[PDB]
Design a protein around this nucleic acid. Structure first.
Ligand SMILES: [Mg+2]
Ligand SMILES: [Mg+2]
Ligand SMILES: [Mg+2]
Length: 803
RNA sequence: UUCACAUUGCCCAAGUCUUU
RNA sequence: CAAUGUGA
C-alpha cells in the first residue's frame, strides 16, 4: 500500500515519431556537497529578505568563513556549498547588518551526488529526494534574487516593450524551471509563461488608469464616493514606496488638505516637516502600515512598488488582451523556449559554475509512438463503424448504439418572447427532430407543453406542474437568454429537488441552428435519457475486458484563488457496463483545499453496488484514474485512497479482493512535446498527432509512467497528459495500459473526438463542476448544509445528469 | 447554457516583516 | 465550470 511498482517493460505498439521535449540535459559532478542549517532571528522575514541577509553575510564574512566559496541558499534554513566551510561541525553565531540580524550556521550533512547517479542508473532502488532538492536550490539561487519568483517560475518586466492591460496592470513574461530525474540524465525542465503584474508607476498614474482618466486634471474636485470606493478596492493590500516601503490598508475619506492626524492636517504636515507643497490636495491619502494607527501618505509622494503579482481576477477586457499577448502555436512556443535557453545561459551562472553543473542548450530528442485509435461502433440497422483520423470522427450516416425514443417532452423558454419567438421555437424543434431521427433517437412528436416564463421564481412551480401533470415525461428542454441565475435554479430543481432530466440551450442556438450544434446537443440528450451513444469495437479492446472490470475516475476541485472558506469538492464516477460507456456519479463536499478524497470508501462502495445492480457481475479488477495529484502528494494520496478502495471491497464482502490499478492523471504539468520534423506538425497549431505516446528518455528512471497526448491539438500547444501508475495488482504491460488509456479517451459521450484525458476522469470534473453550480451563493451544521446541497434526487442518482 | 482544444483560476509549490 | 480566444 506504499511503494509504486517498477516499470514492467517498454511499450512497442504504434509507428515511431521523432519528438523534442522542453527538457534540457544536465551534467552533474560526482562529488559530495555540504548542507548547513541556518537560523535567522528574527524569523518572520519574507523569503526574499532572508536571501538578502545571507548575501550580505557571505560577502561580509568572506574573510573568516567564505574564501572563494559561493554558497547557495533556499531562503529559509538550507545552505549548500561545493567545498567544505572551515566551520567544522560547530555552530557559529554571526551578526549581520542589513541596509540587524543574528545568524547561526550549523552543519547538518553531506549530500552525495554520486548516489544520485547510481539511483538514475537504477542501481539504487530509489531517488534521493534531498539530493534533488539540493540541485534545485543551486539552480534557483540567482534567479530568485534577480527575478520575481512565483511558484516554480520566475518573472521579469520585458526589456524594450510594454504589455499594458489597463487598470494599472501589465503582462510580465517569465519561465518555469524545475530539476527532474529521468531514465537518461538529470533534466532541467524549462517552459515559458506569462502573468499579470502591477506596473511600477506613480500612484497618481495608477489612480488615472483605474478611474479611466486621461490625466488627473480631469478630476477637478474630490472623488465621488463611487470613484473613491472603486480606487480603494484596487489599491488596498498593495505595497507602495515613497527608501520606505508600505502596504496600503485603506484610503482616507477626506482629502489631504483636510485629513488630520494627532492634531494636524496631512497637507500641512508635509509643508512644515518636508517643505513640500502638494499639488492635488483635493485627493485622498493612502493609509498604510497598522490599520489601527494613523500613517497617511498623499498619493503624490507614492509609487506602486515594482514586482507585485496581480492576484485578483482580470476583467474580461484584460483577459482578452492577455490571451492576445500570449497565445502561440506549438512551433512558436518551441522557438520561444529554445530562444530563452540560449539567452538564459545557465552555464555562466556563477553558482551553477561553483557546483560544476553544465546544462545543454538544446531540447532533448525523444522518440514517441503514435498509437492506433480504436474503431467506434454505432447502432441502428447498419451498425456503422467509425474510424478516428487525427483524433476526430463524426456521426454522419450513423445511429446511436442504443438510442432513446422520446415520446413525452416539454419546452420551457425563459428567454423573452420578443427575441425568442414562437417561430424560432417551432423552427428549432423541427430541426432538432430531423437531426434526432437521423441519429436514431427519434423525437416522435411535438412537445406536450411549451410555455414562456421569466425569472428564477418560476422554475420550481413550473417543474412541479410538469412532473405532476405529464406521465412518462422524459425531458424538459430549457431555453435561456444567455448568462442567468435561472440556469443554476434549473439544475437545483431538476437534479436535486425533483429528479427530472433537463437540457438547457442558449437562445442564440435556438434562433440560429446548425447541424453540428444540434447533433452535439443530441449526444447529450441521448445520454441523459439513458442511451448508449456508441461503444468501443468489442473485439478491438485490450484483454482486461475478458473479465468484469470497473473503471473509476476521481477528481477534487478546489475553490478559486483568494478564497478562504469554500469547500473543496470530491467527485468519483464508475463505469456501469462492459462497453464501457455508461457511468454513475458520487460527489462530496470536503475540507477547504484538501486534495485527499476524505469519503472515498463510501463513494466506491456506492459505485460497486450500482455496478453489480447494473451488470450482475462483481468486478475482478478496479482501474482508478485519479486526476490532478502532484508528485509531492503521491504517497499521502495513495496511502489514504488505496486503502479506502480496499476498505470499500472488504466491507462489501469477506475475501472480496479485486486487483486495483491506481493511476494518477496529470494534465497540468510543464512538459511539452514538439514534432522534430515539420511534416509531422498537424494543422494550423502545428501540434503532435493524437495518440503520441512517450515512455522513454524523459520519464521516471524506475517507476511506471508515460505521456499520452490523446487529443487533436486545435490551438496553442497541446498539453500531453501524464499517467503515473502508483499501484498495480493487475500487472499490466506498458502496451496494454497505454492502449487501454487511449481507448478510454474515445468513450467520452459529449463529442465524436478523442479527448485529452480518459472519459472517467473527464466525467469526474463535470460532476464536481455541477456540484459547484448546486452550491452557488450557498458556500458540522455547516457541513451538513453544504452536503445536502450537492446530494442529487433519488431518481437522479443512477443517471448521467452531469453530461 | 452544443462541443472540444488552448490561457488563467485548483493539491504540492509559491506567497506573508518594521514617523504620520 | 467561469472569463477569453481558436475551431467543428
Ligand atoms: Mg482536481
Ligand atoms: Mg504549502
Ligand atoms: Mg469557454
Amino acid at each position: 500500500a506504499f511503494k509504486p511498482p517498477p516499470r514492467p517493460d517498454f511499450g512497442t505498439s504504434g509507428r515511431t515519431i521523432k519528438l523534442q521535449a522542453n527538457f534540457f540535459e544536465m551534467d552533474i559532478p560526482k562529488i559530495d556537497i555540504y548542507h548547513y542549517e541556518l537560523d535567522i532571528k528574527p524569523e518572520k522575514c519574507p523569503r526574499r529578505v532572508n536571501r538578502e541577509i545571507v548575501e550580505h553575510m557571505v560577502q561580509h564574512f568572506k574573510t573568516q568563513i567564505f574564501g572563494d566559496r559561493k554558497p547557495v541558499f533556499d531562503g529559509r534554513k538550507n545552505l549548500y556549498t561545493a567545498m567544505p566551510l572551515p566551520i567544522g561541525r560547530d555552530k557559529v553565531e554571526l551578526e549581520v547588518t542589513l541596509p540587524i540580524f543574528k545568524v547561526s550556521i550549523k552543519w547538518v550533512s553531506c549530500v552525495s551526488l554520486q548516489a544520485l547517479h547510481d539511483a538514475l542508473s537504477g542501481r539504487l532502488p530509489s531517488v534521493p529526494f534531498e539530493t534533488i532538492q539540493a540541485l534545485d536550490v543551486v539552480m534557483r539561487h540567482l534567479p530568485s534574487m534577480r527575478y520575481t519568483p512565483v511558484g516554480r517560475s520566475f518573472f521579469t518586466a520585458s526589456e524594450g516593450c510594454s504589455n499594458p492591460l489597463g487598470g494599472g496592470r501589465e503582462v510580465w513574461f517569465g519561465f518555469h524551471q524545475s530539476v527532474r530525474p529521468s531514465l537518461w540524465k538529470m533534466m532541467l525542465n524549462i517552459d515559458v509563461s506569462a502573468t499579470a503584474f502591477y506596473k511600477a508607476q506613480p500612484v497618481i498614474e495608477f489612480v488615472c488608469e483605474v478611474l479611466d482618466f486621461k490625466s488627473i486634471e480631469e478630476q477637478q474636485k474630490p472623488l465621488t464616493d463611487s470613484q473613491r470606493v472603486k480606487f480603494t478596492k484596487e489599491i488596498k493590500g498593495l505595497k507602495v514606496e515613497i527608501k520606505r516601503k508600505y502596504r496600503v490598508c485603506n484610503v482616507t475619506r477626506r482629502p489631504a488638505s483636510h485629513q488630520t492626524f494627532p492634531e494636524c492636517t496631512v497637507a500641512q504636515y508635509f509643508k512644515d516637516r518636508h517643505k513640500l507643497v502638494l499639488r492635488y490636495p483635493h485627493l485622498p491619502c493612502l493609509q498604510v502600515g497598522q490599520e489601527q494607527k494613523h500613517t497617511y501618505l498623499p498619493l503624490e509622494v507614492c509609487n506602486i512598488v515594482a514586482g507585485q503579482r496581480c492576484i485578483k481576477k482580470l476583467t474580461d477586457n484584460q483577459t482578452s488582451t492577455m490571451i492576445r499577448a500570449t497565445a502561440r502555436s506549438a512551433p512558436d512556443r518551441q522557438e520561444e523556449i529554445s530562444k530563452l535557453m540560449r539567452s538564459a545561459d545557465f552555464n555562466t551562472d556563477p553558482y551553477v559554475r561553483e557546483f560544476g553543473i553544465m546544462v545543454k542548450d538544446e531540447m532533448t530528442d525523444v522518440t514517441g509512438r503514435v498509437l492506433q485509435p480504436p474503431s467506434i461502433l454505432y447502432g441502428g440497422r447498419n451498425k456503422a463503424i467509425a474510424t478516428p483520423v487525427q483524433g476526430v470522427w463524426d456521426m454522419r450516416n450513423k445511429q446511436f448504439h442504443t438510442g432513446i425514443e422520446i415520446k413525452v417532452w416539454a419546452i420551457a423558454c425563459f428567454a423573452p418572447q420578443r427575441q425568442c419567438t414562437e417561430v424560432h421555437l417551432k423552427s428549432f424543434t423541427e430541426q432538432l427532430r430531423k437531426i434526432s431521427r437521423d441519429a436514431g433517437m427519434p423525437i416522435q412528436g411535438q412537445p406536450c407543453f411549451c410555455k414562456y416564463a421569466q425569472g428564477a421564481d418560476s422554475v420550481e412551480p413550473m417543474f412541479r406542474h410538469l412532473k405532476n401533470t405529464y406521465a412518462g415525461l422524459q425531458l424538459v428542454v430549457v431555453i435561456l437568454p444567455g448568462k442567468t441565475p435561472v440556469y443554476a435554479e434549473v439544475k437545483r430543481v431538476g437534479d436535486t429537488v425533483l429528479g427530472m432530466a433537463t437540457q438547457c440551450v442558449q437562445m442564440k442556438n435556438v434562433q440560429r441552428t446548425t447541424p453540428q450544434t444540434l447533433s452535439n446537443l443530441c449526444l447529450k440528450i441521448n445520454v441523459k435519457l439513458g442511451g448508449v451513444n456508441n461503444i468501443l469495437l468489442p473485439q478491438g479492446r485490450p484483454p482486461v475486458f475478458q473479465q468484469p472490470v470497473i473503471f473509476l475516475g476521481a477528481d477534487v476541485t478546489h475553490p478559486p484563488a483568494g478564497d478562504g472558506k469554500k469547500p473543496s469538492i470530491a467527485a468519483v464516477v464508475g463505469s456501469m457496463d462492459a462497453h464501457p460507456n455508461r457511468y454513475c456519479a458520487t460527489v462530496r463536499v470536503q475540507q477547504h483545499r484538501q486534495e485527499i478524497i476524505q469519503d472515498l470508501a463510501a463513494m466506491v462502495r456506492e459505485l460497486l453496488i450500482q455496478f453489480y445492480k447494473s451488470t450482475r457481475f462483481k468486478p475482478t479488477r478496479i482501474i482508478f484514474y485519479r486526476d490532478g495529484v502532484s508528485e509531492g502528494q503521491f504517497q499521502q494520496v495513495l496511502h489514504h485512497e488505496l486503502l479506502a478502495i480496499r476498505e470499500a471491497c472488504i466491507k462489501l464482502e469477506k475475501d472480496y479482493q479485486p486487483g486495483i490499478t491506481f493511476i494518477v492523471v496529470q494534465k497540468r504539468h510543464h512538459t511539452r512535446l514538439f514534432c522534430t520534423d515539420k511534416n509531422e506538425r498537424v494543422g494550423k497549431s502545428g501540434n503532435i498527432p493524437a495518440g503520441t505516446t512517450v515512455d522513454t528518455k524523459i520519464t521516471h528512471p524506475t517507476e511506471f509512467d508515460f505521456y499520452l497526448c490523446s487529443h487533436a491539438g486545435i490551438q496553442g500547444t497541446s498539453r500531453p497528459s501524464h499517467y503515473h501508475v502508483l499501484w498495480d495488482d493487475n500487472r499490466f504491460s506498458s502496451d496494454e495500459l497505454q492502449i487501454l488509456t487511449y481507448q478510454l479517451c474515445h468513450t467520452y459521450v459529449r463529442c465524436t473526438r478523442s479527448v485529452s484525458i480518459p472519459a472517467p476522469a473527464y466525467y469526474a470534473h463535470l460532476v464536481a463542476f455541477r456540484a459547484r453550480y448546486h452550491l452557488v451563493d450557498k458556500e458540522g451544521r455547516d457541513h451538513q448544509a453544504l452536503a445536502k446541497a450537492v446530494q442529487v434526487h433519488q431518481d437522479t442518482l443512477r443517471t448521467m445528469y452531469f453530461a
